[PDB]
Amino acid sequence: DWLLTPGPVRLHPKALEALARPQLHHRTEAAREVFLKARGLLREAFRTEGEVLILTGSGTLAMEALVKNLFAPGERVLVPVYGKFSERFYEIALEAGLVVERLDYPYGDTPRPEDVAKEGYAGLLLVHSETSTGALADLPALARAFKEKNPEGLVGADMVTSLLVGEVALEAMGVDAAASGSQKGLMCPPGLGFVALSPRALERLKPRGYYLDLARELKAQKEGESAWTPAINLVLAVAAVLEEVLPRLEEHLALKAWQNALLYGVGEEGGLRPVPKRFSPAVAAFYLPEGVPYARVKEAFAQRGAVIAGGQGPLKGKVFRLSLMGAYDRYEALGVAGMFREVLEEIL
Amino acid sequence: DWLLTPGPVRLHPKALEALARPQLHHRTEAAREVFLKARGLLREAFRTEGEVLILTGSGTLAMEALVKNLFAPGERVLVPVYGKFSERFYEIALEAGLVVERLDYPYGDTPRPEDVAKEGYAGLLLVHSETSTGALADLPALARAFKEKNPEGLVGADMVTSLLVGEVALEAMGVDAAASGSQKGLMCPPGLGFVALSPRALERLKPRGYYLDLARELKAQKEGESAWTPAINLVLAVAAVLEEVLPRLEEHLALKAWQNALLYGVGEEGGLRPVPKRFSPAVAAFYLPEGVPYARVKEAFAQRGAVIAGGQGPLKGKVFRLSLMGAYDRYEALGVAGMFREVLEEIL
């Protein structure tokens, strides 16, 4: 079965090996160690000198925890919306009781550095890789233009589909805090959320909420434990994958960029229009050819044993996404390219 | 090898099979049906005509969602405290912005129906099986005593270690809403929390929060979806276990009751004193003998290859706990009883 959706993805062989292990009690010495090195590997993967917290829940939970624990109700935050997930970061900021300035961009576009260079804001919330459209935001440039007008401001980023897929960094990119999940680039099952905090953010921590109180978790996770029972089985999988991938990170990042470029190359070769301008290595988004419904593309891939994804919002019924973000190598990617050729040769 | 802690537990064989299955996309028709299947089975397990929502997170998350979505800020709630987890409910109520009457009971004790027969409260929060002490509250009796004085009140319950361990029901026991998790009686890995809502509670829904807003989870779960990406792998495990246990529920409950009574039998003949007055089939709690430290009992079991649990709060360093709540049969339990015998002969 060819899973070509941008989350959940094709599982890494090490993940299934970890999930087959007998249940471990989260308070044992063996569990502490596993939790601690997963902490440390995520720390390395995020490129930060700060701390990374493991939350038991989906990526959306990590996004909410990030916003809640760094901004107090009533504070000024700027949130650009250029897709489904950025649209989600705006709703979280609103629910969190923040004063939100909303900036709109067509789905497929990304924010301009001069649009975020506004004075009078405590923070900026950005979606690095907007999975819904396939667009990659220029994180360093946006953060830098914002910091200049707001020296004491914080920059929070959604790196759910950029972690282990593309180049990522925290303080080096001018980003103070980031959120990620387990079912995208990590090639693990859904169920875990991650919150990376730079030394800068750790110092600005405004603890609040209950289940997602980060101060609570920081105290416990320092010692290899957590506030509540964590999805320890999944933590074992994350650790195993990172141990195998981290030593060959650049090689892995190059492979993922090549695979996505392969998908765009095949689609363009067949006359398809890319949705975004800035390509994210996490997914390839194409507009549907004139006259052909999403259902036909959907069904043609299904007949080949592949599961794909469609559009959302204004893109609903106008596009289709393909993703090799899962555990696929160089040659399986070529196999998919061939599968894609067939779908086009049959649909056009 | 011998996990004897009241969560996480020894995994059911069907759970390990489910976890070995290739990753499924949560939006495929196959996933929808499995999700709906689980919804329906948990429905039967809880004994309700209402709805059961599957949340990705630990049991604590389900407790918070229950409280947040049924009580608005400023409302009067009665919360009896007689253990770690009831304690737990109290803190959640405070953070949720509620006016809380806290009635303290010695760890090991349970509330009297006459103690909660107070007029003027919007709700009552109870812990069915207080895992920290091994106490079992008389849920039906407590619920109607409160209802007599508060006809319009709501009774929320923590059934984390009572679901599939002992007899449970929602409306039939006077309970409007309940919360449970995946790593206790269900014999599944940690990672899922469940909020069961009776028809009564469904009409009283006060949607609030973001990730844990039950209104849009209900909207989505009705159709076999979820608000965000669910831990679909764990959902499969939950469905598989419920499919096997539910048809033989009565036998499963009798076995668990017999297994726990087996542990208390061994401890009592060895001169140990039980902690609770009312016994929950989820765990066997004992007071440490005079002079012998917890570490001695902890190490005695460890050298036999078993993991046990200790006391929390006022019972920290004063007691130890044993649990056969995991996937153990008649004869594995008898083996544990023998191991318990040996530990007793050594420490005394």
Side-chain angles (χ1 to χ4, degrees):
Chain A
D1 193 65
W2 300 86
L3 195 156
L4 302 173
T5 54
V9 301
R10 222 299 198 62
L11 300 179
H12 185 96
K14 279 300 181 0
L16 291 171
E17 178 184 303
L19 294 173
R21 303 300 188 70
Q23 186 67 235
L24 295 177
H25 183 264
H26 61 312
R27 278 120 213 228
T28 61
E29 289 64 80
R32 304 299 191 56
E33 299 183 337
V34 176
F35 203 89
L36 274 168
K37 87 299 181 0
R39 287 298 300 320
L41 291 173
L42 282 162
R43 206 299 203 66
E44 191 181 332
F46 267 108
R47 297 299 187 62
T48 186
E49 293 177 300
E51 299 296 312
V52 179
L53 299 169
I54 300 181
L55 303 182
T56 294
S58 77
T60 297
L61 181 65
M63 287 173 77
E64 185 181 327
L66 183 163
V67 177
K68 283 300 182 1
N69 295 260
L70 291 177
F71 302 104
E75 293 197 271
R76 288 299 291 225
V77 295
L78 185 58
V79 187
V81 174
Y82 40 110
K84 198 299 181 1
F85 300 107
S86 46
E87 155 71 38
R88 189 172 295 179
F89 229 165
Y90 167 70
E91 292 179 7
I92 288 175
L94 278 179
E95 194 279 325
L98 276 35
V99 182
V100 193
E101 188 73 84
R102 207 298 193 55
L103 296 173
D104 281 297
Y105 296 90
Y107 272 40
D109 277 5
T110 55
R112 289 299 215 68
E114 53 263 57
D115 292 339
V116 302
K118 298 300 180 0
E119 205 172 310
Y121 294 94
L124 171 64
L125 298 170
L126 301 162
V127 172
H128 192 186
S129 169
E130 179 54 78
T131 324
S132 69
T133 67
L136 188 70
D138 194 351
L139 226 52
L142 295 166
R144 185 297 274 296
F146 175 86
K147 277 300 181 1
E148 291 181 334
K149 293 300 180 0
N150 306 268
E152 280 91 276
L154 291 174
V155 178
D158 170 336
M159 297 181 172
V160 179
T161 50
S162 62
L163 179 62
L164 233 70
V165 186
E167 222 69 51
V168 156
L170 229 51
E171 48 266 32
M173 293 193 141
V175 179
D176 305 289
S180 195
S182 60
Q183 81 281 23
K184 297 339 182 2
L186 272 177
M187 305 168 273
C188 287
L192 294 179
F194 312 113
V195 178
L197 299 166
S198 68
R200 228 299 266 295
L202 289 169
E203 190 177 11
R204 306 299 194 75
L205 208 62
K206 300 300 181 1
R208 131 298 193 90
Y210 192 83
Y211 183 87
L212 50 64
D213 181 321
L214 267 38
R216 237 299 213 315
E217 291 289 6
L218 197 54
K219 259 300 180 0
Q221 300 196 25
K222 279 300 181 1
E223 240 56 61
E225 297 172 305
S226 50
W228 333 110
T229 305
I232 193 65
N233 312 58
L234 269 51
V235 174
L236 242 174
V238 166
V241 172
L242 292 173
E243 274 183 21
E244 219 265 296
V245 177
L246 265 293
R248 287 300 177 67
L249 187 57
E250 294 304 315
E251 183 182 83
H252 176 79
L253 297 183
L255 175 70
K256 286 300 179 0
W258 178 83
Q259 291 172 316
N260 204 57
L262 177 62
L263 293 178
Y264 270 120
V266 169
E268 292 170 354
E269 197 160 61
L272 301 181
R273 317 299 211 301
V275 176
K277 300 300 180 0
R278 295 299 218 68
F279 297 176
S280 173
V283 57
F286 302 99
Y287 277 106
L288 288 167
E290 202 60 60
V292 45
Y294 171 62
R296 303 300 168 61
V297 181
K298 201 299 181 0
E299 185 174 42
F301 268 104
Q303 185 184 44
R304 311 300 206 289
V307 178
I308 68 167
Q312 296 130 146
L315 301 184
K316 203 300 181 0
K318 294 300 180 0
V319 311
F320 73 93
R321 311 177 278 168
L322 296 184
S323 181
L324 283 176
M325 179 160 56
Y328 291 108
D329 76 353
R330 208 299 210 298
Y331 310 98
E332 291 171 317
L334 287 175
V336 177
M339 180 194 284
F340 195 5
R341 289 300 210 318
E342 293 182 359
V343 168
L344 261 32
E345 193 177 319
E346 176 189 306
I347 218 165
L348 293 177
Chain B
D1 283 316
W2 295 93
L3 180 56
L4 303 172
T5 51
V9 300
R10 222 298 248 293
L11 299 185
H12 187 106
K14 277 300 180 0
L16 290 169
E17 294 185 52
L19 294 182
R21 298 300 175 170
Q23 187 70 50
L24 287 180
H25 189 269
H26 62 306
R27 292 300 130 105
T28 191
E29 191 55 51
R32 305 299 186 53
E33 290 177 24
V34 174
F35 203 82
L36 275 173
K37 219 300 180 0
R39 289 298 304 320
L41 293 172
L42 284 159
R43 234 297 279 313
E44 293 180 35
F46 271 109
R47 297 299 191 65
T48 181
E49 207 66 56
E51 304 288 343
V52 184
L53 297 175
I54 302 181
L55 307 181
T56 297
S58 72
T60 302
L61 180 68
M63 288 169 75
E64 179 172 336
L66 182 159
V67 175
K68 285 300 181 0
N69 291 259
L70 287 175
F71 301 100
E75 295 199 57
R76 257 299 207 152
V77 297
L78 179 52
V79 181
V81 178
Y82 42 104
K84 196 233 212 146
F85 303 104
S86 42
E87 151 103 72
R88 226 254 218 354
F89 238 161
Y90 168 70
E91 296 177 18
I92 288 176
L94 281 178
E95 193 280 324
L98 304 179
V99 188
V100 190
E101 173 165 301
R102 194 298 195 43
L103 298 184
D104 285 277
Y105 292 87
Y107 273 41
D109 286 39
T110 55
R112 313 299 173 56
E114 318 84 59
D115 298 344
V116 300
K118 294 300 182 1
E119 55 175 43
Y121 306 84
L124 171 66
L125 298 178
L126 297 163
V127 173
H128 196 2
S129 173
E130 180 53 80
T131 321
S132 67
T133 68
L136 185 66
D138 196 341
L139 227 54
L142 292 172
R144 91 299 195 81
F146 177 80
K147 280 300 181 1
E148 279 185 18
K149 296 300 180 0
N150 304 276
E152 297 286 52
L154 291 165
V155 179
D158 173 334
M159 291 178 180
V160 178
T161 55
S162 61
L163 182 69
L164 238 68
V165 178
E167 286 289 341
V168 297
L170 247 55
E171 50 267 40
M173 295 201 316
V175 180
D176 302 291
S180 189
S182 58
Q183 84 280 16
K184 296 341 182 2
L186 286 180
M187 299 165 287
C188 290
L192 297 181
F194 315 100
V195 179
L197 302 161
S198 68
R200 216 299 200 89
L202 291 170
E203 302 174 294
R204 301 299 289 283
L205 208 62
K206 296 300 181 0
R208 158 297 214 62
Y210 194 79
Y211 181 87
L212 85 207
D213 178 324
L214 269 35
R216 119 296 246 136
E217 276 289 9
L218 194 284
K219 190 299 181 1
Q221 298 194 25
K222 259 300 181 0
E223 205 186 301
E225 325 271 354
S226 57
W228 336 109
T229 308
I232 192 66
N233 308 62
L234 300 183
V235 174
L236 267 166
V238 169
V241 168
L242 287 174
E243 274 177 55
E244 187 187 288
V245 173
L246 247 40
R248 302 300 191 210
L249 185 61
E250 220 62 53
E251 296 91 306
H252 173 79
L253 298 181
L255 176 67
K256 286 300 179 0
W258 176 86
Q259 287 175 321
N260 201 56
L262 182 66
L263 297 178
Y264 273 119
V266 175
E268 292 177 324
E269 68 166 46
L272 306 186
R273 241 300 162 197
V275 178
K277 305 300 180 0
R278 271 299 219 76
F279 307 81
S280 170
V283 58
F286 298 105
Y287 276 110
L288 280 169
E290 197 62 63
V292 49
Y294 171 65
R296 215 300 173 72
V297 182
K298 194 299 181 0
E299 291 176 74
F301 274 105
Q303 60 184 78
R304 308 300 203 285
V307 183
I308 67 170
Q312 302 128 120
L315 300 181
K316 206 300 181 0
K318 293 300 181 0
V319 305
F320 73 101
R321 295 172 290 138
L322 295 176
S323 183
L324 282 167
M325 178 162 54
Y328 292 109
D329 72 358
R330 211 299 203 300
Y331 309 102
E332 287 170 316
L334 285 180
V336 178
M339 181 197 290
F340 193 12
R341 292 300 213 313
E342 298 189 357
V343 172
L344 254 36
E345 298 177 342
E346 183 185 300
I347 66 172
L348 305 176

